[PDB]
Amino acid sequence: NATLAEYDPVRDMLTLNTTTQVPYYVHLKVAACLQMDSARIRVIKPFL
């Protein structure tokens, strides 16, 4: 398991590359758990 998280403080945007089969769910839970608007989050599943 692994997650690469890139937070851009200038723009307050977050980009994740993570070991998931469900990037949509990760997108939802990261937004809700960080109380961060989903439009500021980008989730990418690279090779898994």
Added chain:
Amino acid sequence: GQGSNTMASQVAAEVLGVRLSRIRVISADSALTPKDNGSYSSRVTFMV
């Protein structure tokens, strides 16, 4: 690893009558690809 990128290419090429090689699949990047519910319960081949 199950082959959904191949599966999607195959069925789309079949309908279009083109060769597999004419299709470039871009997948699982929220800024570019349409949301998918996830690779669980073997829903991918059937629905996607």
Added chain:
Amino acid sequence: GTVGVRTPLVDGVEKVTGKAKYTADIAAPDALVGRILRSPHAHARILAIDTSAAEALEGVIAVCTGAETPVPFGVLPIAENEYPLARDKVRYRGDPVAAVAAIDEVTAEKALALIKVDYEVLPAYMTPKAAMKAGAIALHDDKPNNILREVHAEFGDVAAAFAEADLIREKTYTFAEVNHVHMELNATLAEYDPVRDMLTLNTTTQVPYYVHLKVAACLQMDSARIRVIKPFLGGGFGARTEALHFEIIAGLLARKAKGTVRLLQTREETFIAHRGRPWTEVKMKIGLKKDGKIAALALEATQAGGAYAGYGIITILYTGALMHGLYHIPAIKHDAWRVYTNTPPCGAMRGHGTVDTRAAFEALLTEMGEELGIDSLKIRQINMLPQIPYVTMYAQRVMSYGVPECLEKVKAASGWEERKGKLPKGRGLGIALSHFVSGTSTPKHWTGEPHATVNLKLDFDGGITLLTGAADIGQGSNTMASQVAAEVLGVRLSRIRVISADSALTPKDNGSYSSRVTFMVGNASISAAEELKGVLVKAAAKKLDAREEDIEVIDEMFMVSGSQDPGLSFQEVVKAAMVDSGTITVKGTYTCPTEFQGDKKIRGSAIGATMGFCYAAQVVEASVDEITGKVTAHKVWVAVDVGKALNPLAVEGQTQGGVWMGMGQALSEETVYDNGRMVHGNILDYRVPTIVESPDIEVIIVESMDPNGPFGAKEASEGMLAGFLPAIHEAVYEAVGVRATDFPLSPDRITELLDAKEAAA
């Protein structure tokens, strides 16, 4: 709102942190080093070529020659005469003859030396007059007299118009050839996948679409097997608005090596690629009335165009096309010759083809107005287009014109009235007007496609992705497109992620040339945002139980017009809009109306035809040291009609850059060849101005509000370059009393003028 707001470019953060990856910064561990064997002769036939010793060198993976590149290329479909690698003959020193891909630089360098080439040296011609001499060997067989294209046109009765003039003068002006000197060196990273026979390129281009076409045609590879990506680009200013040989060679080598090849270029090789502004001789003849009104104009322009066609035909047409649309001129005669020479091919450079004739026209008008006792700023005000709209004799349709305000603005800002003609000994003030198109309204390739296409995507997350094939080359197109789409949607700039110039993902765009991007991609972007806004308004209306016409979008809120209730947040509307829909994808397009594409019965009138012009008026204050002859530009006051400044911060920077590149051509830049050999191949002897002598430049924005531009906008990057030359020319005359006729006005030319004026009188 986002439009009209001073906005840092959306990709600025990556530039100041060094995170922006330009072509040469892209990691590719498996990359072979590519190198090109260039011709040491200016003109010669290739008799034989032997690559066997190079091919046998350990570490050499591939070696190619012209035998493998049987298809020529040219930016214009009607004139493709350049081969990626030379076949039969070379036509300038630097002309590519062979190329190699090796494991490292030292090996690639050894490989080049091992290639044996037998040449039959031919006579080389440096000037138009020499290349045109009877008996001169033809660079290209289809043009026996080395004249690529001649233009001969007349508008109105010129002879009659001149007979009606009270004062007629003519003068000849010469302009050195200049180079773009974009700071990033040319480079291409070519990745060939032999398992699938696919090629992917990252390259230093302003026109990834053209590269896509030329690589497919030149390698005889289906375009569907090629992917072109423009990463961050370190400028271009015209240099990269044509597919360049090293990009094609990189792909050729990658395929031959069955792998990846990184082809870097030195600064000298970047100067060799050239495609800059041609050396130009301009004969200017102007007829005026005693009151200052223009009666007639006759001009001749000869350009030394280098060794291959390229943009030549278009460039030579431009020498006359923009003699129209600025001043009302009763009759115009235009003669011009584009001549092949054994030097690097010339091409498009900021203000493409209109700079030199514009400078010549402005200088003469000013000189004549002095003989008539009319103030140089006044004589321009006197000749402005009488009414708007104005259809020029060239068939251009001017629907917006801010020249009146531009002149009044720079007149006031520079304190022209109280200072012109009343400055200390050695100082002067000059005025000039210039303008340029907001995109050539006719694509180079007639595919019947819209002139710009923008796609938008909006999914459950609420982030809007804007996909455009447009190339942001530092001018800000990624920001421009974001701004106009956000304005239409009533959202914040930050809600838009722009994905650009990657053929596998973004809609094709014709390229960042002729200042077509803001006008066309801005309109296309507006159009796409309207499509999306409509989808969202429908969902909001349904959820608010209101009529769609009643919905207003303000700061990401959808509400019923004039209601006391604030409404739905953007995210609630997105949620509603997803129902029965899922991911929303819309397409927006823009196409120039036929009426703005010139006159069909005037072949070539498409060049110079546009939706509208950016106009610029500038006053330059300079001083001259008579001991050294050096001219110093202290300040420039410049007012530019850009229709509507979408981003005033960018308009200012674009205008300063354009005026400054003109100052470089006016005072210190010039290429120099010695029997075919480049002498200026470095940035020490090719004098790009440093920050020390560079003038301060104050920008005044004028908004004539064009009826067809995005939010009323026109271009804002080329129309102001040309005016600096005549303006400082006038300032030098007031400062020391000499009239330069040759640019640049470097110290050597000024002291010669000072010595002659002192020999006489």
Added chain:
Amino acid sequence: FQEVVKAAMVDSGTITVKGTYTCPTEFQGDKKIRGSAIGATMGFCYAA
């Protein structure tokens, strides 16, 4: 295919299409049975 693509670009430019799929309500279990959505599917893979 390339000649058709060329023809298709006229008056159109880039083509982008959207395809979707949704399971009919009848395959989503029985509304009056608790949690019957779990186990409800469009079809089963069978193995011997």
Added chain:
Amino acid sequence: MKNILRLTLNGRAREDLVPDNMLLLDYLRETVGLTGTKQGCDGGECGACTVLVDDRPRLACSTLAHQVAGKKVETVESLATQGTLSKLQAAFHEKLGTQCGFCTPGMIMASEALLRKNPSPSRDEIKAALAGNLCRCTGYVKIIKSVETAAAARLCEEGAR
């Protein structure tokens, strides 16, 4: 031949086997992989490769990597604090002292050296410090404004401003 090179780069100790003939520019771009430092010319003419060596500007393309042994070297990648821009970087971005962005790393490093040595430079002093840094996009006007804005933002309150 390769020999040991010890230095502090962007705040971190480095101890590498480096070719005696390696330019600092190539060591940075290829050995450490820091691509922010650019190559804009064939040698010493443009300043795109400017980095800091013990607080002073140095052309990485005209410096052998081995000549900076035991010194403190900084590239454009070291200026931000994690993802937060320094005042100098924010000013170049906000005032548009950067367009294509290619000359920017070098221009910002020369600006950083100036501001560390002369906290409140005059307009002529800014020009003099950036004299060897070529930019083709800006006409330089907004680069000068960017440096003045950065200087004020960093400048001390208890002194003349």
Added chain:
Amino acid sequence: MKNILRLTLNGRAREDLVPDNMLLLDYLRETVGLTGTKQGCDGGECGACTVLVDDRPRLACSTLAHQVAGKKVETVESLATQGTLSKLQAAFHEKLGTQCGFCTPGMIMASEALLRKNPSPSRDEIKAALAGNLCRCTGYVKIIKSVETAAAARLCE
């Protein structure tokens, strides 16, 4: 402490200052940047980090980088010729001896070492050589087919 390490890696001479306590796995993935070699466990249990040292298989996660001084080291990145797959790689791809692909680099390196030492391995010999390499996707069936196909293709080269 760092000390000089000289070896041949994927056909190229390396001369680097490497920490005495650095594992070959980390030297490869972090110092040289070759990410093909994977880490699938906490120490010697899965073979995902298998690479070649003088033609023989070696677990990069349980080998100090300094122990391979002067040897010839090869990772999955070295098998192809520029972009053209080796017969063994083409076989894994074509026979589907690879699904998610995570165990593949290690599986292929162990297979390569087998095929260099025993050009025509029996099915039992293939299993014996790949005994320490764990795969969770394939059930191993097509991995064995892949190796048999590569062996035959390398014989009638």
Added chain:
Amino acid sequence: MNILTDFRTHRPATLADAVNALAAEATLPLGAGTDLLPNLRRGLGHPAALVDLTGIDGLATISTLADGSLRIGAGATLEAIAEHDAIRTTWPALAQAAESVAGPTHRAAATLGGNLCQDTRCTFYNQSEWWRSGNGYCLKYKGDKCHVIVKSDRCYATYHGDVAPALMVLDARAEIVGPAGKRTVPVAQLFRESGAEHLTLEKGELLAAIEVPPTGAWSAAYSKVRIRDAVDFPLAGVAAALQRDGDRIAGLRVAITGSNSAPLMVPVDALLGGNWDDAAAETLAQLVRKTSNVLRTTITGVKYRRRVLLAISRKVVDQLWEA
């Protein structure tokens, strides 16, 4: 990666160590490399080794001697020299010349020794390996013909160093160290008017320091001409030192650069005792013209370079006289 020969880079801690390293073949001294590296990158030289002098302790020290003389180690940077308060108040021409060199970034590391010993320049020489091999190289390096003066009796590449002329009118001395030992010569003698052997340093020799004597009744200045206001080498450079008695020229020293294969003193005794007037200025101009030998080794023309050389010679003496 930028190609350079596979040379060894020696980093001596002392002059003796540097001198010993320079004994080997094809071994070159190295200062900050602002002149040498661009040259080596273009293929102008194929050294087996470079001897870095920037690591020699104390080689960059600047100090004022017992007798009020200035002592500058060869490793001192042009920036340190241009900013040194004592130099700026007492030997301003030196600070002026140093500051006029290249750009600020080059000056931050460029050394005094490297500036004086910089190579001569020519448009057939400062070009790439591809450009030069294509043209048959030339007499200065790998060929046998001079393309500027076809007679080819010698290389005519021009010396464009800015500091040399200033040190020359200030009567500075050059301290040289080599295998034979230490020796000192007037700075003007460090140069030879020959494009391809422009320095009088012998195998194994290094310029170790420069010493400038107290100025006494002399005032000096340096003036340089270039098209851009920074970076450019001098198209012409003139340094002058003056001693004024009432309204007569008691002492005059004039040195030129950017004009010959060496920076040179101009014989001006004919002006001693005279006044400084239009007639005298004209005699200077012609004296300067005679000594100068402006040739087309530059992209800029000879006519202009000669015209401003003469013009600024007047200008700089005039500036001194009217001070």
